Write a structure and sequence with these properties.
Belongs to the nuclear hormone receptor family. NR1 subfamily. The chain is mainly α. It is built from eleven helices and four strands, in the order ααβαααβββαααααα. Bound molecules: 2-[(2~{S})-2-ethylhexoxy]carbonylbenzoic acid (2 copies).
């Protein structure tokens, strides 16, 4: 029954708002807004970076460390959202870990797109905006870790999804039965089948003129995999070149034996 699918869509969107403080709606209002109350301070070079610290050791590493801290925070928010997905907390506890282990980063880059345009990315809960060019200008190990994310974002943002769409799509990503090491795949696939039904109806009702948006959104899950694998390889180079830099334990376990 379609009424049951709309109830699941509403449930996930409600939990989405409650779990993620900075939504796409708020992010787009800051990036495009004529508004005067929520304009961000823009960081585009070293001087503005130093002044931005007042308004809001090596620079490249200090940026990379703050990027980690935000990723850890995003994992915490994604984990809170996953518990709201009907059936997720009832699954085998080991599979819950496995689904989060492989899903968080694919979700992080999906939602990171909400904070991005072709010119840069919002930071500090929308208070700041770091330009895409300043990130490319960083030292050779840290000058390339965001550029692939921007490339995905500009394409993904062309789909013009809103938060109500993303809430369901994010749930579909977590409940993937093809994750390595899943003990009982069937109960996971049964949940995804229902989430996929809810996403399909959501996109046909919210985007009636967007032809095959459902299929085109699912195909984007291939771009996400590429980003993760490329990011993992970049992290291995950094751990060898910078033996004094520390990675967050939560992020270390997520990447432990990923592929
Ligand atoms: C401009 C701010 C972008 C922040 C987002 C996370 C929401 C993307 O950061 C990462 O994915 C990341 C970056 C450096 C080191 C580790 C990671 C990581 O998650 O493992
Ligand atoms: C909730 C929305 C994102 C919030 C966080 C920061 C709390 C995003 O900020 C960053 O990742 C970041 C990147 C480069 C330089 C500084 C930072 C930084 O720690 O501010």
């Amino acid at each position: 029954e379609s009424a049951d699918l709309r109830a699941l869509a509403k449930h996930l969107y409600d939990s989405y708002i409650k779990s993620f403080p900075l939504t796409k709606a708020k992010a787009r209002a800051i990036l495009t807004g004529k508004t005067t109350d929520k304009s961000p301070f823009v960081i585009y070079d070293m001087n503005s970076l130093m002044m931005g610290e007042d308004k809001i050791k090596e620079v490249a590493i200090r940026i990379f460390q703050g990027c980690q801290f935000r990723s850890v925070e995003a994992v915490q928010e994604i984990t809170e959202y996953a518990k709201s997905i009907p059936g997720f907390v009832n699954l085998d506890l080991n599979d819950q870990v496995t689904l989060l282990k492989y899903g968080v980063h694919e979700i992080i880059y999906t939602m990171l797109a909400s904070l991005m345009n072709k010119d840069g990315v919002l930071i500090s809960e929308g208070q700041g905006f770091m330009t895409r060019e300043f990130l490319k200008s960083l030292r050779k190990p840290f000058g390339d870790f965001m550029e692939p994310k921007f490339e995905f974002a500009v394409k993904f943002n062309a789909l013009e999804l809103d938060d109500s769409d993303l809430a369901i799509f994010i749930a579909v990503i977590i409940l993937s039965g093809d994750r390595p090491g899943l003990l009982n795949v069937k109960p996971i696939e049964d949940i995804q089948d229902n989430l996929l039904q809810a996403l399909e109806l959501q996109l046909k009702l919210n985007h009636p003129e967007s032809s095959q948006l459902f299929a085109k959104l699912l195909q984007k899950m291939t771009d996400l995999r590429q980003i993760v694998t490329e990011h993992v390889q970049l992290l291995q180079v950094i751990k060898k070149t910078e033996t004094d830099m520390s990675l967050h334990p939560l992020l270390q376990e997520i990447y432990k034996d990923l592929y």
